[PDB]
Every structure is written in structure tokens, then in C-alpha cells.
Nucleic acid binder design. Structure first.
Ligand code: MG
Ligand code: MG
Ligand code: MG
Ligand code: MG
Ligand code: MG
Ligand code: MG
Ligand code: MG
Ligand code: MG
Ligand code: MG
Ligand code: MG
Ligand code: MG
Ligand code: MG
Ligand code: MG
Ligand code: MG
Ligand code: MG
Ligand code: MG
Ligand code: MG
Ligand code: MG
Ligand code: MG
Ligand code: MG
Ligand code: MG
Lengths: 182, 260, 134, 169
RNA sequence: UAUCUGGUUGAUCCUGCCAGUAGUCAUAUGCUUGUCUCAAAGAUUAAGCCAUGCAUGUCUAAGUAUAAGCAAUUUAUACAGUGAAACUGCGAAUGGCUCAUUAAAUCAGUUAUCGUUUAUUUGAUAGUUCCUUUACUACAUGGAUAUCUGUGGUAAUUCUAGAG
RNA sequence: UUCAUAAUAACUUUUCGAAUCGCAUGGCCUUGUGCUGGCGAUGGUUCAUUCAAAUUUCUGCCCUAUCAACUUUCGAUGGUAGGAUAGUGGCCUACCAUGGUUUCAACGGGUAACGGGGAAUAAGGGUUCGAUUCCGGAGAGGGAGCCUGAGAAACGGCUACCA
């Protein structure tokens, strides 16, 4: 009885299971942006839908009066920092049209691929999980990390491990011993 | 059940401790004393969560045993003494005296007060009554009873208290156009002037109180504490000074002020 | 190579506890882990405290080695450090001794076996010796 | 037999369950305020007894081994000053620091003197603590007499101000 | 983040229901199960039953000490260092568990106690006890009871009877 | 306010007004060991305050008319007086009056009902759930009765009867 640490079943399924075009359209997304699950998509869709839900419940009220203006702006501020929303569009009514595809292209997954490094997309997810890639001076092994647009530039290979060039790749310790034997 | 309650469970812990949801099933029950359960502040919260002079309750306990801590002149060794509103807490090692005063948000604040002024405690009324030997006596909402007061120290009117001796330095009357600090929930820790006093028969005396910014607000009398006449409040108040800004106003001041 | 680049954030000086209490941000450039005995050497030379009076805890490195964020105290003296600090921290450093004691349940069994009797145990032992004939 | 103690004032030569509070014997109460029904034997003697206690008040002919030959001295004695004053029979004028059974106990080679913890005296520290309390009693009475006089004066000072304001129209 | 399909027909459009569909800090189970953080967990049926052990006791410069205890040594010719035991004090009415009762009852907010108790809490504080006033306990009144000393019982028990 | 409080009158199986305790050993000589005085502890009186405590105001519950009357001999509703209680009171007692509630569902029954906070669901309106981390309330096998105590109708107290 400290307190129930709250949580959410955050990421929530669609209300049918077999809309053929959705089943493809979700595959397309998991193929383009390399997602192991449908979950990874619904995760974004819900995470996004929560925002949308705010935007609707702000746009119901008059933008000029307080919450509408403040919470809406803070909601926009949040998105532009996370880098989904453009700098062309900061008008709340544009937040309403954000979509899942724009959210995914902001993940650390993709911003590896968009800055080169990996080649062929998935490789990044593998690099990320395999403890390379440091956004700050701090390793990240979540693919779905959401990059901060400000921090985008700081994405490089880790101080530790290969590719940064500290230690080469764990079959060298095999063949450096094997070549020394010959 | 079966008489008074000895524990206080942390979620039930009054919010203006700013006690931590986790890191303990319980909260420190403020012990019995001059200030009401929720309106008090037990020293564990003061010395640990607020000031961080202790890293845990143990160290607070010892800090009170060695004994430089002196809440309102007297020493205290009580981990959960009701150090409520106005209570001058003087730590003689460091010389860091603190008056207990509400931040505009509502939650109490560390005000790193002078030698010096932390020497009187402002205190309200309460009573006016008389006791035995026909002695007229005054009582402070903020704890103490003081004997033989000036006849025209009336009710809901403040009194400066000598604190170390515990007598009467001076008093501020309650009436129209007098700087008034606030101690009631939503308007808690705001400051203002006083315009009206709706008398009201039975159902609580109201007071219409314009701040520096002249945003009017109403409270009840019981939640109002006359800090002086306008311009000169008798206590040194924290940065913010009882204004209470709007939400966007606070967001503006934060993201404007970025000095790395 | 590495140099164990120690730092010392949030120095809250404390006459009530007779210490400077603070966080220890630390680094490992290519080394892995800092270790505590190595830290108190680095806190001794930095604060003029000596290993004895320094008391550090918490840490838990970030991730990718990188960093470690301790919670270093530096007392005013060794005698001061002994009489304030909880015993377990004095055991860690080798200053105080580990308090050799009986198990918890055995202490409670010993409490209740003691609760069961009344007065002095010399009376019940002499009665028990008399019952050997019975 | 069986082993229930013959409580006095009970009557009958029979076994009786009986309610016994603190303030009597026959029950060592393990709560500060508590009654309880322990069993008890009556006061009158019957065949079922193993044991009667018998105070051998006045002596007779045959002294038996060491029941009336040897003498076990008193372990404890007078603690209070008025007790030591009765026991020896000294009165007030004899003064104090001695009449006490110090014991010379040995650990092994070392041999040194024990002593009691005797109470009650007109001690210098006792006297001064009374005089201090007596002073506080007087000084607190003066201070409140002074404070009462000051507000008897202050009320009169206000009373003159009321009379000046009132008389006009 | 307002969503519908299959089914009575020869086929049609309805009434209509059933069936699916999604989710449940909603129970159960069936497979399967590598890691990280977090983490409910004998409520549902029997407020059914309970071996064993434990979960409430507490002493400070500071209520009571000739333990025939420990101390031991450079305050005791009444006492003063530690202190088992015990009485006194206070606590054990807190917490914990549970949901059987219980349907204007409980309970929520709302008042009220000018209708009351309140150890503790921190603030306050009692020349008047005398009883005619020329020789009176007050620089200190009394005897008990416990722990103890033994005398014991019992088939048992955190049973305790007598004397000092 | 018949309040606070103050008076006149007394009582009373005359409450309380320290025959209590640890550290500190100062100040005047009427040169006694005199008279004097510091820092604390507990205790103790009603007034305060706090922790609370009992009541109590208003409004608010799930299903059932295959419950339309119910309460009032055995307190129901009111009154006068007492008794009790810490205290208000049909809380109890005497004497008196005949009230009281009801289709704006009294009363009765049901509840696989502890109440609330909340939970799930999730356009809006809602439905169902809330034993369960907080807040109330109850209970400690049942049902009683009580000791101590500020606070217990305690149950890691006791007395009993049933099981
Ligand atoms: Mg309880
Ligand atoms: Mg009122
Ligand atoms: Mg690594
Ligand atoms: Mg006891
Ligand atoms: Mg609908
Ligand atoms: Mg048909
Ligand atoms: Mg067909
Ligand atoms: Mg269905
Ligand atoms: Mg003693
Ligand atoms: Mg009156
Ligand atoms: Mg009282
Ligand atoms: Mg009456
Ligand atoms: Mg039920
Ligand atoms: Mg319900
Ligand atoms: Mg509930
Ligand atoms: Mg149930
Ligand atoms: Mg509860
Ligand atoms: Mg049971
Ligand atoms: Mg009972
Ligand atoms: Mg209990
Ligand atoms: Mg029990």
C-alpha cells in the first residue's frame, strides 16, 4: 500500500480485425519503416490519436480564450520539438492532420537510415538493438525512441563499440589470435 | 475507530507537504499542537523534502537531538511537530532562519529570513475572551494564547508577538483597505487589499480582496490573515509576493528566462 | 587513457550533520565502472577529506558505461563520520566492524522464551534440577 | 492436590473457580487493569491437601538440625533515611554517609567495597532545588502582580481617553 | 480516433432476433515462454476450520536498587559506577486484515455542539490550607505491599499460599 | 443566550492548593554553617489549542404493488416533569394527548448490496462493476456483558452461554 503505480494499456487495437486494405496498409508501414509488430504501428496511431483527441477538444472551444490557446500552443510546442509537425504549420488545426507515417519517420529507427550510417533501414534496428548508436553521449537501444529534431544532428555511432572505431567487431579477437598462430 | 488515529497514510497526506507518492506507505502524521493537521507542516517534511539538510528521517531525528533547531524560540526534538503558518524555524548552525509562509501556488516555501526580523511572529485572533481572576485574554489561530491584551485588539485582527518572551509588540486592526495574506485552498497564499466584508448572519464572513494586479477575489475570514496596511506588509514575503499569475503568464516567464 | 574524470555536483554544506553532502557525477572514457575505494581516494585528494571521512553511495551507471551518478558525502572529521552515519556504511568502507549477531527469528524465539518465564531464571533451573528425581 | 492455592476468606474444603482482580493475591494480572477467573481452593482444610503452611511462632524443646539453630541474616535492609533512623535508633543529630552494609566482593585477585543506593535526605542539592522552586513560585507571582498592575494602569489610561471623546455635544 | 457483416427467401424489401466483431488493473483455464522496468496475487465458494512459530511493548543526567548481580577504581563512613528483577508511569483503542451485517442505515459533500467529553499537544495560571492570636511535627508524617530470603503444592498453566 | 465573567448563600461522605526527582554550587556577612539564589524534570487546576469524539442539518441510494397500507398491547408521534448520559434527545420512566409516515411509493420483501472515492467501457447521452492500495463504516466463531483506561461495549483483555 505505497500507491498503485499507474499504467496504461497504452496501445490499442482497431475495432475490426480484418479490413483487408488496412492489413496491407499496416504491412506497408511495417515494411517501409521496419516494424516488428502491428503493435508498433497502433502504438503510434494511439499515441497520435491522444493528441488528435486533445486538438478536437480544444477546437470545440474558441481559440482566443485561455485553455484552447495555452494547452493548444503547448501541444504544438511539444510536437515541433518532437519534430513531427512542420515549422510551416503551427496552427493546431494542422495538428489534427498528422498521420502515423509522419510519426514513424521521426523515430530513431529511421533517423539512423535518413542520416546514412546503416544502409537498407532494418540494419539500423539491428544496430540500435546491438548497442551502437548514441543520440547524446548516451547509448539508445530502443528503435522507437522518437528523435528530438534538435538532437537529430547529434545522432552518431557510439563512443564505445565499433563503427565509431573504438573496438572493431568480436570476430577480430578470433582471427587476430588465429593470424598470430600462423 | 475506538478513539483517535495514530498513523497518517501517505495518499491521505495533505498535498502541501508535496510528499512523494512512492517511497513510503505512510506519511508523518503531524502531531498535536498549535496548527491543524492539514494546515501544519511537520519538520521531517521541512528538513528533508524541502531543505534537504537531512537525507532521511534518521538524520532529521538526530538533527533535532543536536538541537540547534529552534521552532519559535523553544527547541523541539519532535520529528513531526506542527510547524504551521508563521512559525519561525531558526537553525543556529548555518544561521538559516526560516519563517513559514505559503508560495503563491499553495505549497509552503523556504524563505531564508534575516537574523533579525525572525524574532517576532505575526499571529491572528480567534478570541478575545476572559478567563478566571477576571483576566481578559487573547488567542491566536496560529497557536498561542496571550494574556492581558489591549482592549481594542478585536477578532480576526492580527497581533505581532515578541516570540522569545511571548507578549505583545503591536497589533493591526482588521478593516477596509488593509494588506491581507490568504490561507484558504484556492486563494491560498495570495495577497491583497480588502474592499468589502460581507457580514453574513451565520454563514461565514466573506472578504473581497484585490491584489497588486487588481484581479478581485473572495475568501472567508478564517482563511485571511492581516499582514499590514497597504505598501508595508510586516513580513518579508517570497519572490512572487502574493500576486498569483495566470497559467500562460507563468509559461511566458519560464521560456523567456533562459540564462545558461 | 581514461583518468576516472570525477565531478562533484550539488555541494550542500551542512554544519548540522558536519559534512558537505553532494552528488558525484563520474566518467569512464574506455574504462568500465569506477568502483568505490578508487572514488574515495579521488574524493580524499580533491576535498582534503581522507578516505576515512568520505562516504559515497547509490551510483548505478547510466547505460553504455559512460557515466555514474553517485551521492558523495565528505564529513568534517573521522570521529564525526563515525557517530552520524548508519552502521552499514561504516562496514562498507572498513572503518567500523561488522556487527556479528543472531538471526531474526532466533531473536524473536529468544524474546518469547524469555517472555514465557517470569523473574530470574535461577529459580526455574533449581526447580528443574529437583524434578530429575521425580 | 492438583494444586490450586487455598485462598483466605473463601470458606469450604472444596475446589472453586473464582473471579480475581488486581488488589488481591491469587492472580498476577498481565494487564494494567484486568479481572480474570483463575481457579482456587477454599480456606478450610480437608483430606485432599498435600501441603499446609505453618508459622512456627514460639519455640519448644527439640531444635531440629538447622531450622531453629542456624540463622540466615537479612539480605536487604533500610533504604530510606527514616528507615535507617528507626532500625539503629539514631535521631536527627547524628549526621550521615555510614550505617550501611558494605560488602567486600572479589573477582579473583582484586578485592573492593560495594554499597547501596540510599534515598531521602536534607541534601544540599535537595534543599537548593526546593529553594529554587520556592523562588519560581514567588517570582512568577510578582511578575503577574506587576503585569496585572500595568494593565490596571493601561485600562485606566484608555478610560481617560474614552471620557475625553464622549464629552463634547 | 460516432465503422458493421453471415443467417428465415426460389429472390426482394423489412420486423426481428441469433452469430460474429472489439475491450475489460474481469475471473478462470489451454497451450506456449529468452531478457529489461513494473508488479497484483484465498474477495467471489465457507465471515469454514485452524498444528507450529512469529505479528506490542517500553527507561532516560532525571519515578522506585544492600540481585548474598556485574562492577573495580584513587566522592560515599545515609547514598552517587553499571543494573536483572520487579511495582509506578505510559502504550497495548495504532496499524494490519476482512465485507457478514447494513438500503435513509452506512457513505459523500454540507452545516452545526449556544448540545458535549477530549490523556496527549503546545499556550495559561493558584500569598487566603490557619480558625482566636502567651509555649505549635514541617530542616520532612505512617505502616503496608512487591521484587527478594526461603518454606511449598501440582498430572497440567506465562497457577501462585504462608512467614521474614 | 440563562454566554464569558463577576457577586450575595451555603454546603460537600470538602476535589485542588507539590511531606516528588536529576544536573549546576552562585550572593550577602547580622562569621552562623546563617539566610539566601541558577538550569531543569515531572506532576497538578479550570481556561485555551491540537489530535479527535459523540451527536446532528440539508440533499442524495439497487431491484419489487406476484409488498397498499404500516407504526401505536411490549414508545409509535407529540407534550410536561423527572431519571440517566459527557452532553441533546422517546435514550429511559410516570402522567397526559392521538399523533406519525404513505401512490412525490410509507410499510414489507429481495439483493450472488458494505458506502464513497473510483474502474471498464468510451463521439454526445450512457451502462455495468467498485471484496480490493485512500477516506468512512462496520466485524473479529456467534450473540451478550463488562474491567482498566483520555479513548474499548477492546476481543493478539477478561466474564459467561451457545457452536
Ligand atoms: Mg482499525
Ligand atoms: Mg456559528
Ligand atoms: Mg556497451
Ligand atoms: Mg507494567
Ligand atoms: Mg452508440
Ligand atoms: Mg418465414
Ligand atoms: Mg435459401
Ligand atoms: Mg453477442
Ligand atoms: Mg532508586
Ligand atoms: Mg453561564
Ligand atoms: Mg479538563
Ligand atoms: Mg429532561
Ligand atoms: Mg453483503
Ligand atoms: Mg454498490
Ligand atoms: Mg469499497
Ligand atoms: Mg462477498
Ligand atoms: Mg478501511
Ligand atoms: Mg473464522
Ligand atoms: Mg466483544
Ligand atoms: Mg485488534
Ligand atoms: Mg484477534
Amino acid at each position: 500500500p505505497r500507491a498503485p503505480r499507474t499504467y496504461s494499456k497504452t496501445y490499442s487495437t482497431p475495432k475490426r480485425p480484418y479490413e483487408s486494405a488496412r492489413l496491407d496498409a499496416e504491412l506497408k508501414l511495417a515494411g517501409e519503416y521496419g516494424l516488428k509488430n502491428k503493435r508498433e504501428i497502433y502504438r503510434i496511431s494511439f499515441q497520435l490519436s491522444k493528441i488528435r483527441r486533445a486538438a478536437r477538444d480544444l477546437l470545440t472551444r474558441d481559440e482566443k480564450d485561455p485553455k484552447r490557446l495555452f494547452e493548444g500552443n503547448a501541444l504544438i510546442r511539444r510536437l515541433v520539438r518532437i519534430g513531427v509537425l512542420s515549422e510551416d504549420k503551427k496552427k493546431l488545426d494542422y495538428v489534427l492532420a498528422l498521420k502515423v507515417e509522419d510519426f514513424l519517420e521521426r523515430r530513431l529507427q529511421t533517423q539512423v537510415y535518413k542520416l546514412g550510417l546503416a544502409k537498407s533501414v532494418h540494419h539500423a534496428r539491428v544496430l540500435i538493438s546491438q548497442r551502437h548508436i548514441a543520440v547524446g553521449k548516451q547509448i539508445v537501444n530502443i528503435p522507437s525512441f522518437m528523435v528530438r529534431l534538435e538532437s537529430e544532428k547529434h545522432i552518431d555511432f557510439a563512443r564505445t563499440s565499433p563503427f565509431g572505431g573504438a573496438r572493431p567487431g568480436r570476430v577480430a579477437r578470433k582471427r587476430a589470435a588465429a593470424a598470430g598462430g600462423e | 475507530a475506538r478513539g483517535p488515529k495514530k498513523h497518517l497514510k501517505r495518499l491521505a497526506a495533505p498535498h502541501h507537504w508535496m510528499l512523494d507518492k512512492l517511497s513510503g506507505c505512510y506519511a508523518p502524521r503531524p502531531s498535536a499542537g498549535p496548527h491543524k493537521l492539514r494546515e501544519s507542516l511537520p519538520l521531517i517534511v521541512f528538513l528533508r523534502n524541502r531543505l534537504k539538510y537531512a537525507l532521511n528521517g534518521r538524520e532529521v531525528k538526530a538533527i533535532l537531538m543536536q538541537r540547534h533547531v529552534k521552532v519559535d524560540g523553544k527547541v523541539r526534538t519532535d520529528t513531526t511537530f506542527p510547524a504551521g503558518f508563521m512559525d519561525v524555524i531558526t537553525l543556529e548552525a548555518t544561521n538559516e532562519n526560516f519563517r513559514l509562509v505559503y508560495d503563491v501556488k499553495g505549497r509552503f516555501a523556504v524563505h531564508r529570513i534575516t537574523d533579525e526580523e525572525a524574532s517576532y511572529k505575526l499571529a491572528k485572533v480567534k478570541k478575545v475572551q476572559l478567563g478566571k481572576k477576571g483576566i481578559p485574554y487573547v488567542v491566536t489561530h496560529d497557536g498561542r494564547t496571550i494574556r492581558y491584551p489591549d482592549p481594542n485588539i478585536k477578532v480576526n485582527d492580527t497581533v505581532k508577538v515578541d516570540l522569545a518572551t511571548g507578549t505583545i509588540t503591536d497589533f493591526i486592526k482588521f478593516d477596509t483597505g488593509k494588506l491581507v495574506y490568504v490561507t484558504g485552498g484556492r486563494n491560498l497564499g495570495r495577497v491583497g487589499t480588502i474592499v468589502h466584508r460581507e457580514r453574513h448572519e451565520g454563514g461565514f464572513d466573506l472578504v473581497h480582496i484585490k491584489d497588486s494586479l487588481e484581479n478581485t477575489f473572495v475568501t472567508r475570514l478564517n482563511n485571511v490573515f492581516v499582514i499590514g496596511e497597504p505598501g508595508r506588509p510586516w513580513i518579508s514575503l517570497p519572490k512572487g509576493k502574493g500576486i498569483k499569475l495566470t497559467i500562460s503568464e507563468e509559461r511566458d516567464r519560464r521560456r523567456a528566462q533562459h540564462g545558461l | 587513457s581514461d583518468a576516472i574524470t570525477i565531478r562533484t555536483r550539488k555541494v550542500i554544506s551542512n554544519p548540522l550533520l558536519a559534512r558537505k553532502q553532494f552528488v558525484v557525477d563520474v566518467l569512464h572514457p574506455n574504462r568500465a565502472n569506477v568502483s568505490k575505494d578508487e572514488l574515495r581516494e579521488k574524493l580524499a585528494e580533491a576535498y582534503k577529506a581522507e578516505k576515512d571521512a568520505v562516504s559515497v553511495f547509490g551510483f548505478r551507471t547510466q547505460y553504455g558505461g559512460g557515466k555514474s551518478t553517485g551521492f558523495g558525502l565528505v564529513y568534517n572529521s573521522v570521529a564525526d563520520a563515525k557517530k552520524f552515519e548508519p552502521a552499514y556504511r561504516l562496514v562498507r568502507y572498513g572503518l567500523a566492524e561488522k556487527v556479528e549477531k543472531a538471526s531474526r527469528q532466533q531473536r524473536k524465539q529468544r524474546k518469547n522464551r524469555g517472555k514465557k518465564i517470569f523473574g530470574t531464571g535461577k529459580s526455574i533451573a533449581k526447580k528443574a534440577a529437583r524434578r530429575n528425581a521425580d | 492436590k492438583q494444586g490450586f492455592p487455598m485462598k483466605q476468606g473463601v470458606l469450604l474444603p472444596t475446589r472453586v473457580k473464582l473471579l480475581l482482580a488486581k488488589g488481591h493475591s491469587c492472580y498476577r494480572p498481565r494487564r494494567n487493569g484486568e479481572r480474570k477467573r483463575k481457579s482456587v481452593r477454599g480456606a478450610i482444610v480437608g483430606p485432599d491437601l498435600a501441603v499446609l503452611a505453618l508459622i512456627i511462632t514460639k519455640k519448644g524443646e527439640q531444635e531440629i538440625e538447622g531450622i531453629t539453630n542456624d540463622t540466615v541474616p537479612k539480605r536487604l535492609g533500610p533504604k530510606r533515611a527514616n528507615n535507617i533512623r528507626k532500625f539503629f535508633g539514631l535521631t536527627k543529630e547524628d549526621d550521615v554517609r555510614d550505617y550501611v552494609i558494605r560488602r567486600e566482593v572479589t573477582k579473583g585477585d582484586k578485592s573492593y567495597t560495594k554499597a547501596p543506593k540510599i534515598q531521602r535526605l536534607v541534601t544540599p542539592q535537595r534543599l537548593q532545588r526546593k529553594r529554587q522552586q520556592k523562588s519560581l513560585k514567588i517570582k512568577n507571582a510578582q511578575a503577574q502582580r506587576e503585569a496585572a498592575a500595568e494593565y490596571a494602569q493601561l485600562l485606566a489610561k484608555r478610560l481617560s481617553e474614552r471620557k475625553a471623546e464622549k464629552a463634547e455635544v
